[PDB]
Amino acid sequence: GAPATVTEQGEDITSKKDRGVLKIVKRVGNGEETPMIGDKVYVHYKGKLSNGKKFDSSHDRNEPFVFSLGKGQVIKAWDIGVATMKKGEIAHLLIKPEYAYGSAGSLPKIPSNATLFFEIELLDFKGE
């Protein structure tokens, strides 16, 4: 499935090159700008545990998901991954626990030491 494809084929976008955040661009976006830290970012996403045992989508709530990049509003892997995306891009991310919820997890949704998968569409971003 998509998670295994990212394992095999994704780019390691971590600074440490520890394969903690792997990315495939699935649909190319437009322009040269990518979000800077502080920017207000608008996304649609679908996510799940690598193992399929829980799922989540912006669509569940009927509206884009909006966050400020780098303000600790989302997991580290999103701050790292979404900062690489262009407006209109769709990407897949596979994420090791050290860039998500770690050894503690976040019960009941996220177990300890969980690997996470997301599809993310970058709809728009704007400067603070």
Ligand SMILES: COc1cc2cc(c1OC)OCCOC/C=C/CCOC(=O)[C@@H]1CCCCN1C(=O)[C@H]2C1CCCCC1
């Ligand atoms: C650990 O708690 C949750 C995790 C996730 C979704 C949750 C959630 O309950 C608070 O509720 C849906 C509404 O929440 C909005 C974003 C939350 C920030 C925390 O989430 C994140 O930083 C990441 C990136 C942004 C989108 C949501 N995502 C999640 O980790 C998801 C999680 C994805 C894997 C499957 C289960 C849900």
